Amino acid sequence: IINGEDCSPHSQPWQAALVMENELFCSGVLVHPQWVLSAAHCFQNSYTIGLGLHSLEQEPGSQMVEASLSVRHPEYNRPLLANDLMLIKLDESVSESDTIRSISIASQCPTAGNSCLVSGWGLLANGRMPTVLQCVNVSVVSEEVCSKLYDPLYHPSMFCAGGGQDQKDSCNGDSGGPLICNGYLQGLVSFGKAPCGQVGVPGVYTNLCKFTEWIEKTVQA
Ligand code: NI
Ligand code: NI
């Protein structure tokens, strides 16, 4: 996370850490006690998912869960970089707590100007990993602007957020992480232009308002 602050501990109880070989590579979002929503490009053959966390590895009530089952969106990367979402089925349901809670997905598609929140353990402005979960606010960008600077990769499965002079943005490690608007999960950290935090270049997020029916059906199967 670029230019953010240490999260107030367990303020984001839906944050799911995706680790392999004792190393974080992506994040995810708890949308159901046995289901984690993430970016399709965070796909792995098996998952080690950390819940109720703030530091990594340390915190009680925290759970480390196995996951051998995930479902990328059938149209992921068709066209290029589009439909970047997947669902992970936990081996065991999680018992929700105060530090582990689910969030619902926004029905309404994103609104230009809305100040939203994105969280993760991604790189900082200094280029080094944090020890504490990072939060930061970015504002949704109008479609015309989002469509024109990301031509020809712009797709309706995408919406832009951030790109302000405050240089607040998500980066490597934040992938698959949540974009919370108005208490609802509005998007997933998908991609941007390198480097992170460029003025005038908003981050691109998975437009979850377009997959509510796909997500539901996948969970019911
Ligand atoms: Ni704590
Ligand atoms: Ni990524």
Numbering used by the authors: 16 to 38, 40 to 67, 69 to 74, 76 to 125, 127 to 130, 132 to 147, 150 to 186, 186A, ...
Which passages does the manuscript contain on this structure?
The kallikrein (KLK) gene family is the largest protease gene cluster in the human genome and encodes 15 serine proteases that have sequence identity varying from 40–80%, with a high degree of structural similarity around the active site1. KLK4 is predominantly expressed in basal and secretory cells of the prostate gland with lower levels of expression in a number of tissues including breast, ovaries, thyroid, testis and developing teeth. Over-expression of KLK4 has been documented in malignant prostate, ovarian and breast tumors and is associated with metastasis, and mechanisms underpinning resistance to androgen deprivation therapy. In order to investigate further both direct and indirect mechanisms of KLK4 inhibition here we describe the structures of KLK4 in complex with SFTI-1, an engineered SFTI-1 variant, and with nickel (KLK4-Ni).
